[PDB]
Amino acid sequence: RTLTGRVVSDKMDKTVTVLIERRVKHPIYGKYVKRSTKLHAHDESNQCRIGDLVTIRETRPLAKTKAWTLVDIVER
Amino acid sequence: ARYIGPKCKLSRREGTDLFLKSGARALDSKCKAENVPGQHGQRRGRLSDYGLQLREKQKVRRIYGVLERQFRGYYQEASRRKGSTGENLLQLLECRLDNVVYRMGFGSTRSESRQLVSHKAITVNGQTVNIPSYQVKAGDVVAVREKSKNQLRIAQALELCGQRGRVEWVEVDLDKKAGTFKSAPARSDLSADINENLIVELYSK
Amino acid sequence: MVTIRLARGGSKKRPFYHLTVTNSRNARDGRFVERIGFFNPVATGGEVRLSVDQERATYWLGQGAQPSERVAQLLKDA
Amino acid sequence: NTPSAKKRAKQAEKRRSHNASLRSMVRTYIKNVVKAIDAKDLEKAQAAFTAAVPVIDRMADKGIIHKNKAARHKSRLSGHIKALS
RNA sequence: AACUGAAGAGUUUGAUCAUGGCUCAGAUUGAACGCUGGCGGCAGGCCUAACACAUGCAAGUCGAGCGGAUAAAGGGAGCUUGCUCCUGGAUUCAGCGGCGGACGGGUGAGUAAUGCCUAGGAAUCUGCCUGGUAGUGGGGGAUAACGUCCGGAAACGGGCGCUAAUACCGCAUACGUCCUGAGGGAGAAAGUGGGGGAUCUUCGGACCUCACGCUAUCAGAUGAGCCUAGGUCGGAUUAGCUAGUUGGUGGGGUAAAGGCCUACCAAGGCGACGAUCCGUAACUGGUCUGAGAGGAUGAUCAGUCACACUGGAACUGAGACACGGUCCAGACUCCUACGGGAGGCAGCAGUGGGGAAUAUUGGACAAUGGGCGAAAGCCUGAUCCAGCCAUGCCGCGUGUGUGAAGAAGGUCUUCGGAUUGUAAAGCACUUUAAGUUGGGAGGAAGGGCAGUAAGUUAAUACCUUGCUGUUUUGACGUUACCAACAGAAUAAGCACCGGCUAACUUCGUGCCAGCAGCCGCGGUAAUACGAAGGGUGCAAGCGUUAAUCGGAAUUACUGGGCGUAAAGCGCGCGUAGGUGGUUCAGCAAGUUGGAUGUGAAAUCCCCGGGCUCAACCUGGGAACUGCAUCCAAAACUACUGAG
Ligand SMILES: [Mg+2]
Ligand SMILES: [Mg+2]
Ligand SMILES: [Mg+2]
Ligand SMILES: [Mg+2]
Ligand SMILES: [Mg+2]
Ligand SMILES: [Mg+2]
Ligand SMILES: [Mg+2]
Ligand SMILES: [Mg+2]
């Protein structure tokens, strides 16, 4: 289990925010829409930029509404 | 619920022989089957298109003696089985016990065979059956109970088997009165006056 | 505790039991862990009275399943 | 009612009063250590820590506090004595 | 084992084609009502006031935990038929304790969310069960009962005096446990019962053995608590919402991660992919229609959640913030000596009330199950069974044959007849169900007692286990089922008949009364109103009303439209978003194929098997369209690199 998204926020302290896109299909009209997903990955070293491409995985909860962490930065 | 009442009058509307009266005396002498019953037995003209399908369904339903709650129950078991619901609807009416007593020839009417079953006088596998709905299988040795083998209702009816012949899927023994249902009938021993393509179409709409 | 006991299915005056393994504080007809056989007292003709499978009964009885009074004999008479 | 619920009613205060004595005694031997930390006392807290470990653990196997709760005070209070060195 | 259906009609007009509404034919319900009414199987029965409740009963059990008081048989003596006392003691239960009342039964008020489904994972707990491992050493102080005093209308409360335990508390020891930094430090226990070779001794006892119980701990199952991701009704004439609010740090707190809590720090967080707010509603496996796609809907059965007169709150405990527990506040009934008390049928019956509308103050513990004791036994309004109600599905009767002078009798008529009609009558047979009499299984596994053989042992003493022998047990119950007797006797309605639509003529009535699902009939000849004959549909039922889905290609994904029938913004530019010319190369996110884990059981479907058949019950398979993890393929789309 390993996801991938891009960063939109650096405002908080040791906390980053990703967007994970997703193509689900519509159940009756047979068309693939795009619907988003927005998590709070636990940053660890205050070193990611707005516009990166990072990789997350799931741990036990660290604060509330923050259970995902940072694996590694893939590309700028 | 049976049908108790006049019995030429059913044969007199549909306009056929229909084999309801018992003896071989005469059709259209006890009956006078020339006309539609009732007062206005002379006026006729243009049976409706729905009325033709109901007239075919009511004909088959009065040869055998079912009612419609039972008759639609046979129609469900026809559409369950594989292929040719018209033929399957007939072969569930042939395997019924009151028909096979009539085919062996243990009665004059078909309604007489219903009464001989109903008074426990008929056995199927060596044990008593008194239900006029028992679906018999291939190879069931229908025999007559020994307490009533001396009834003249059965003895006289075997001379009424002379105007009938054997239907060539049974065999009857005129000494011990123990018939044997050999196999299922085919779609050649049944008369072509009944139609398997009007009753099926009636139960759609 | 877990236990091996008999359910009850069928009409009036014609029972048909089921060898189930259940947690003890459940209903009769409620939930169960799994089912392993049946028991038909009024079996006649081609019907089979006892139909226990010895594989899962080897498994559960080695882990503290606790049988009933009738099941004390039905596993015995196999 | 029953003559059996009225027995479990009388048998509740005889344990409520009994457990409260065994429960509050634990907390007095813990507040003696914590009030001795705040005055920056190295050997005063060390004496209180010694004669309060047997009081907590003897009240643990009686079944008053749970055994993982007694495992929690002993870890943290050691972490404040090594911070006075 | 794998498996198939799809119908139209009437109505806008002098008439026609089209667009478009409306209405009917179908299958269904926890149904209600009107007319009528023989039977048996299998089912179901407060959908409204979660509105109040008279009276019965629904969770207790252990004397192989310990006091105490009842004291049998019997051992008796004595005295003269009976008492006296004595001796043992079997019973028996108010009290302390161990367990259990957190399971089983009930109801749908609340909640638009992580409640409930599906897929995952990490930070924990778990009495009774199973497998192990190490034990089960000694000691003390109180307490109810019972005494006795005092107070209270009671419901009860208070004091002094006495005794016991597997109650309670120190002390001793301890891994294979906790904390610690290695080093070191800390913590437990309970005994009763059956026997007995030897020996100490009052085999009071020690003693050995067995059964049981208890204390640490690891593992397994079982149950439980948490977190993530997704899906989850209508309203945009609801567009901004939020300061433990959103993160960080330090400290607390809980079995367990966390603003769970607190102190400072920082100014964030969510929102048009619909936040917030309003309105309603318990969800799910499934049921009902449909050819299918879908559409409605969550009665009985099963899983999960939420409540127990209203609002709070914790204790006890393995596990409750607890339906027959505790405390408080309130409302409402009742008691009282006026001081004070008592109670909670959304357990099974039942009453009142509401309403179109919904059942007996039953029978038992025999079965399956639970609780305690394993020693039998004891409790059980959950269960298993009966009673009531055409409330539904499935089955069977209400006779069968012969019989034309074609009888009366009825209705109609061109007056000739036709029709009711072989239908009756007459004649010959038959007796299921109901009635009556006799017979009669299966649901029964055990328990007691006795005997015997195995292994426990120091002792085949006890006890456990095979087996033998003997004895005992059913609410249902007059059982299903079988035989005999009576005699055709015991047993048919309901709507409709102008068109859709199967089936028709006379008589009253005359724009009156009346009919009606739509078209619409009735003004003096009505096949439409009211009757009478006749006839057609269904039957132990038939009709109307209410309510869903079909037909409706009438919200059109499968499957429609926009020149004039309703329907193209007055025209531009443009953000989010949707779609992408052409060559290679890469990649594998879509896509196809396969494997594994899952998708509870039931239900539906297929092949069988049992009840005289069927409904009903039941064995094996398919299916549950899903989601996740792996393996491969590379045409097309996406992404990447070059043109
Ligand atoms: Mg359709
Ligand atoms: Mg009640
Ligand atoms: Mg018996
Ligand atoms: Mg009669
Ligand atoms: Mg009329
Ligand atoms: Mg449609
Ligand atoms: Mg533009
Ligand atoms: Mg299933």
According to DSSP, residue B30 is labeled: S
Determine contact, residues B154/B177, Cβ cutoff 8 Å.
Answer: yes
Q: Give the structural domain span for A50.
A: 1-76
> CA-to-C1' distance for B11 and E561, Å?
56
CB atoms within 10 A of CB D74: 14
User: What's the resolution in A?
Assistant: 3.3
According to DSSP, residue A24 is labeled: P
- Extended strands (E) in A1-76: 3-9, 17-19, 38-39, 41-42, 53-63, 66-75
- Token pair, residue C37, equals 């056989």
Q: Which of residues 1-60 of A touch strand E (CB under 7 A)?
A: 1, 9, 11-15, 17, 23-24, 27-30, 32, 34-40, 42, 58-60
φ/ψ of A53, rounded to 5, equals: -145, 105
CA of B37 to the centre of ligand 5 (A): 22
CA of C26 to the centre of ligand 2 (A): 25
Which method resolved this structure?
Answer: cryo-EM
Q: Give the structural domain span for C46.
A: 1-78
- Token pair, residue D53, equals 């470990």
CA of B78 to the centre of ligand 6 (A): 30
- Strands A53-63 and A17-19, sheet pairing: unpaired
Q: Could you give the number of structural domains in chain D?
A: 1
Measured CA distances, C4 to B102, C25, C63, D13, D26 (Å)? 56, 12, 12, 40, 46
Q: Could you give the number of structural domains in chain A?
A: 1
Q: Which chains touch B (3+ CB pairs under 8 A)? A: none
Measured CA distances, B62 to A5, B56, D47 (Å)? 77, 10, 110
User: Which phi-psi region, left, alpha or beta, contains residue C13 (left: φ > 0; alpha: ψ -120 to 50)?
Assistant: left
Residue C6: give its domain's CATH number. 3.30.1320.10
Cα Rg for chain B, rounded, in angstroms? 18
> CA-to-C1' distance for D63 and E530, Å?
95
CA–CA dist C70, C76 (Å, integer): 10
Q: Give the structural domain span for D44.
A: 1-85
Please tell me whether any atom of strand E lies within 7 Å of the Cβ of C69.
yes
- Extended strands (E) in C1-78: 2-6, 19-23, 34-35, 66-67
CA–CA dist A4, A65 (Å, integer): 18
According to DSSP, residue B146 is labeled: G
Q: Which chains touch D (3+ CB pairs under 8 A)? A: none
- Strands A53-63 and A66-75, sheet pairing: antiparallel
Q: Could you give the number of structural domains in chain C?
A: 1
Please tell me whether any atom of strand E lies within 7 Å of the Cβ of B114.
yes
Contacts of A70 (CB under 8 A, 6+ apart): A16, A41, A42, A43, A44, A48, A54, A55, A56
List gaps in chain A by the residue before each (C–N > 2.5 Å).
none
Q: Which residue has the tokens 């469900």?
A: B76
Could you state, in order of their start, the residue ranges of all structural domains in chain B?
Answer: 1-96+191-205, 97-190
